[PDB]
Amino acid sequence: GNYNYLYRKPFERDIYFPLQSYGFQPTNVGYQPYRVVVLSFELLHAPATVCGPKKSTNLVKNKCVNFNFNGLTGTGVLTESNKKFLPFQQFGRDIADTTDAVRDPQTLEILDITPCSFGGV
Amino acid sequence: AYTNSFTRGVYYPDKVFRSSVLHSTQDLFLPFFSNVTWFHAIHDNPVLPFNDGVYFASTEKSNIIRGWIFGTTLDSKTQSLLIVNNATNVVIKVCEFQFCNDPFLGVNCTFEYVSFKNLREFVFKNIDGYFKIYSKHTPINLVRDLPQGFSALEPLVDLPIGINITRFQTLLALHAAYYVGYLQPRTFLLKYNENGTITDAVDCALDPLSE
Ligand SMILES: *[C@@H]1O[C@H](CO)[C@@H](O[C@@H]2O[C@H](CO)[C@@H](O)[C@H](O)[C@H]2NC(C)=O)[C@H](O)[C@H]1NC(C)=O
Ligand SMILES: *[C@@H]1O[C@H](CO)[C@@H](O)[C@H](O)[C@H]1NC(C)=O
Ligand SMILES: *[C@@H]1O[C@H](CO)[C@@H](O)[C@H](O)[C@H]1NC(C)=O
Ligand SMILES: *[C@@H]1O[C@H](CO)[C@@H](O)[C@H](O)[C@H]1NC(C)=O
Ligand SMILES: *[C@@H]1O[C@H](CO)[C@@H](O)[C@H](O)[C@H]1NC(C)=O
Ligand SMILES: *[C@@H]1O[C@H](CO)[C@@H](O)[C@H](O)[C@H]1NC(C)=O
């Protein structure tokens, strides 16, 4: 078969001796070759740079809105803010882990998120 | 030679803004008041173990220290990380290098990336095949050595290289002084100020008052 295909921490790479070769022949189902792609998604709080086809709206300020920034879905009154985000930081967090401020992905300004007005009746 | 690190080698643990808060974090940090091995860029470029990860720093006036080598055997039997600054530029490679007998910069590459007066501080660590670089740069008033007092390092570069590291070395530009300290898995408590900035820290395992 196609013996040009061979086998041997997380995301470890390593290049009797260790290699063995697959006998991939069309006559082989479990003994047949399969291709595999593994997609790893880097969620981390830097700027996003691989995003879905979902089209951006305009921005809205000083009014309660059902926002989404880079997949960060939420609801609140968005307002301009004085928070000095360092260049590597995209989001800011509350004591409760809930996002308290964001940097917008298209214009690099910083918004506070304030939850919409509420109380007991 | 040797010196003591004092309150140095803290870095921002994640890319999240925080302010007016004391935040606990557990990570590979340089321990407070630890020893660091000291070397002189004058009159010194040996191989070093890497262990869990490395703080590296240089006190400078002429830019002699310009890069690093990392890997396991450093002998072309495996892929090995090379990092270099060349004036205006940064270049990074992972080839199966057969390195020089005494590495200096003259005044399968499965991955590639491109882009005393002062203290330069760096942190290097390898996690899940990613190699992570943090740094800070400052003028200094102390002529001799690492300064006492507190400052924090920021993430600059993060590379998905998929390579093992247990030895490293530093690269001199040839025809100042430099420092090495191993990180440890430590809990730190970090004071984020009103201006989003880490401005104080406690290494919890330093002493009973720190606990
Ligand atoms: C990373 O490289 C080191 C060698 O520098 C590997 O450590 C050796 O591991 C084998 C078992 O696999 C032991 O017999 C040796 O005694 C180890 N040597 C040392 C110096 O510790 C290590 O296994 C490699 N790790 C990964 C995740 O690839
Ligand atoms: C990205 O979008 C903003 C408007 O949302 C615009 O000001 C900016 O110039 C755009 N950048 C590029 C490179 O087109
Ligand atoms: C620091 O290193 C010196 C030798 O250079 C040693 O005598 C001393 O005990 C060490 N101190 C600590 C805190 O490890
Ligand atoms: C740095 O080195 C690269 C090749 O490694 C080269 O393309 C670049 O022009 C160099 N820049 C300087 C300032 O030497
Ligand atoms: C690249 O890796 C292969 C094994 O996959 C090895 O046979 C070859 O000699 C290596 N070539 C270079 C230039 O490092
Ligand atoms: C915070 O920033 C202001 C300027 O925006 C500055 O005047 C003040 O001294 C800073 N305070 C601290 C503790 O860094």
Furthest C-alpha separation in chain B: 52
Measure B94 CA to ligand 5 centroid, in angstroms.
13
Q: Note whether A9 contacts B129, CB cutoff 8 Å.
A: yes
Q: Of B14, B15, B17, B128, which to mutate for an interface test with A (greatest number of A Cβ within 10 Å)?
A: B17
B10 touches B147 (CB < 8 A): no
Tally of domains in chain B: 1
Residues contacting B159, CB < 8 A, separation 6+: B92, B111, B113, B130, B131, B132, B133
B90 touches B66 (CB < 8 A): no
Full domain range(s) for residue B116: 2-211
Chain A nearest-CA distance from B151, in A, is 15
Encoding tokens for residue B61? 């006036």
Distance CA(B166)–CA(B185), nearest Å, equals 17
Entry resolution in angstroms?
Answer: 3.0
Residues contacting B209, CB < 8 A, separation 6+: none
Distance CA(B108)–CA(B93), nearest Å, equals 10
Q: How far is CA B162 from CA A11, A12, B23, B128, in A?
A: 6, 6, 31, 8
CATH classification of the domain holding B60: 2.60.120.960
